[PDB]
Amino acid sequence: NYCFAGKTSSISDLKEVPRKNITLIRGLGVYEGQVSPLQVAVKTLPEVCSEQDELDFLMEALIISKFNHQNIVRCIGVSLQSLPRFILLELMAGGDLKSFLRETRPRPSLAMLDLLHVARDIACGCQYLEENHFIHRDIAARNCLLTCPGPGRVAKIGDFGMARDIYGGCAMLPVKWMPPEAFMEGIFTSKTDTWSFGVLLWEIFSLGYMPYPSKSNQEVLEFVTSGGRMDPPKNCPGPVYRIMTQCWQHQPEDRPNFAIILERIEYCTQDPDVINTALPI
Numbered sequence: 001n002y003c004f005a006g007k008t009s010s011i012s013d014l015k016e017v018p019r020k021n022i023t024l025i026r027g028l029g030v031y032e033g034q035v036s037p038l039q040v041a042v043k044t045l046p047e048v049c050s051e052q053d054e055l056d057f058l059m060e061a062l063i064i065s066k067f068n069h070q071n072i073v074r075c076i077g078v079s080l081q082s083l084p085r086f087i088l089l090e091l092m093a094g095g096d097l098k099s100f101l102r103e104t105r106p107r108p109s110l111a112m113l114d115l116l117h118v119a120r121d122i123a124c125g126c127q128y129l130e131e132n133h134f135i136h137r138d139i140a141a142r143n144c145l146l147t148c149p150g151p152g153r154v155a156k157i158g159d160f161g162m163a164r165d166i167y168g169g170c171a172m173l174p175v176k177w178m179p180p181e182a183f184m185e186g187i188f189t190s191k192t193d194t195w196s197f198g199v200l201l202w203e204i205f206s207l208g209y210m211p212y213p214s215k216s217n218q219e220v221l222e223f224v225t226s227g228g229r230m231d232p233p234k235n236c237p238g239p240v241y242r243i244m245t246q247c248w249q250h251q252p253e254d255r256p257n258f259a260i261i262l263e264r265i266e267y268c269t270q271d272p273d274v275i276n277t278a279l280p281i
């Protein structure tokens, strides 16, 4: 049983697709697939898995199925009555955002306005989640996807594994994306996602760098609790960095909600001094 947006659903509300219509085309590093012809992404549940795993996998399908927003990957259906168990998802030809930023890094193509649109796209999805009282818990560039690598790309939140687990270890917590109260007290609110979006904003304008580059998890933990914060990414415009620093306010009540973040991202797309800033090569 899953609840969201005022309703409770179950494995039944999902759209079961008969296994016979589903064809795998590639591994994607998750597979490209076909449904008779619709092009989809197929998330597979290993047959070698525990019973906790099985329930983990079912919840994710219910979670993503209850969202209706252009910046959240669509759930096409499921194939759970056959093995291995499939979740069918919107295909995002652009791939994940962290790799795209790394491969598309300018070299001897991509401009400041493109990064702001990605940031706006993800901020729009987070607002939708916030307005519906869903806490993602793992906003990060690795969990965002792009429709296409070229112009007119749209970014969307693509993975909800963390929100399903707490619905898995100290060395596995995304500490570098978490605010103090989260890794200290295990408190999670919409203001948890605000902090994480700030780190995501740093990932975006650093063009795919790991946050707190030379630090370890425990170093970051002690750095952040003491009040330390990352420096601007190379060439990052001031107005963009100021969004990050507002997202990283120590007290959650001093952080902006996602409506304000969107508002400030849009004001940055209207500033020539911002969008005419060159990326580092």
Ligand SMILES: Cc1cc(-c2cccc(Cl)c2)n[nH]1
Pocket: 028, 030, 041, 073, 089, 090, 091, 092, 093, 094, 095, 096, 145, 158
């Ligand atoms: C849920 C989902 C993942 C993807 C995808 C991941 C990596 C590369 C590419 Cl081309 C697509 N699309 N949809």
